[PDB]
């Protein structure tokens, strides 16, 4: 078994791409790229696509559990929210790509213990004004789940205690509820 089988991930994941085109509605700009459910298929996908730092501004990547679309409207996102990492323009060079890949591995490696079931997915927004990365969770009222994912996330990105990150509900997005 060991010699020849791919290594299965706990979940099947879908990678999505967004390109800003003012000709189209936001949802029409959102497109699914492919899915994978093994370590080896993840790295084949990742190794084939552009680093976030190399995308034109206005683009997003999103990685979500199969069955969950990367949009507020989805039943598993409507009552939820996101842990938000805001980066300055200098961090495009220094942090964007490494932070995004760490976010990817927190999801597929199920890095948040009993609360990895609350995880829906993650998004990186590439923007001239300042890039963003976020982990989306499914229920903004689940205080223990949300806070625990926030603490683990902050430390896995190696952020200092001088930084604070915020959790915002999509309901208000469409203010911070929690900070760690």
Q: What 3-state class would DSSP assign to 52?
A: helix
> Which one among 15, 71, 124, 165 touches ligand 7L2, defined by CB under 6 A?
71
Name which of residues 10 to 29 contact ligand 7L2 (CB under 6 A). Answer: 20, 22, 24-26, 29
> In whole angstroms, how close is the CB of 144 to ligand 7L2 at the nearest point?
25
Q: What 3-state class would DSSP assign to 107?
A: helix
> In whole angstroms, how close is the CB of 162 to ligand 7L2 at the nearest point?
25
Q: CA-based angle 21:27:28, to the nearest 5?
A: 55
Q: Kindly tell me which of 13 and 64 has the beta carbon lying closer to ligand 7L2.
A: 64
Name which of residues 94 to 133 contact ligand 7L2 (CB under 6 A). Answer: 125, 127
> In whole angstroms, how close is the CB of 23 to ligand 7L2 at the nearest point?
7
Instruction: Tell which phi-psi region holds residue 14, choosing left (phi > 0), alpha (psi between -120 and 50) or beta.
Output: beta
* Annotated binding residue 16: no
Q: Kindly tell me which of 54 and 173 has the beta carbon lying closer to ligand 7L2.
A: 173
Q: Is residue 89 at the binding interface for ligand 7L2, with CB under 6 A as the rule?
A: no
Can you state the angle between helices 96-108 and 143-156, rounded to 10 degrees? 130
Give the binding site for ligand 7L2 (CB under 6 A): 20, 22, 24-26, 29, 58, 71-73, 125, 127
């Amino acid at each position: 078994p060991e010699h020849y089988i791919k290594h299965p991930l706990q979940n099947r994941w879908a990678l999505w791409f967004f390109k800003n085109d003012k000709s189209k509605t936001w949802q029409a700009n959102l497109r699914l790229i492919s899915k994978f459910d093994t370590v080896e298929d993840f790295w084949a996908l990742y190794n084939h696509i552009q680093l976030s730092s190399n995308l034109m501004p206005g683009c997003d990547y999103s990685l979500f559990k199969d069955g969950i679309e990367p949009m507020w409207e989805d039943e598993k996102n409507k009552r939820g929210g996101r842990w938000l990492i805001t980066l300055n323009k200098q961090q495009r060079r220094s942090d964007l790509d490494r932070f995004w890949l760490e976010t990817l591995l927190c999801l597929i490696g199920e890095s948040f213990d009993d609360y990895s079931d609350d995880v829906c997915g993650a998004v990186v927004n590439v923007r001239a004004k300042g890039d963003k990365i976020a982990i989306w969770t499914t229920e903004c009222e689940n205080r223990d789940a949300v806070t625990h994912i926030g603490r683990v996330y902050k430390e896995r990105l190696g952020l200092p205690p001088k930084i604070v990150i915020g959790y915002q509900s999509h309901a208000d997005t469409a203010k911070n509820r929690f900070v760690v």
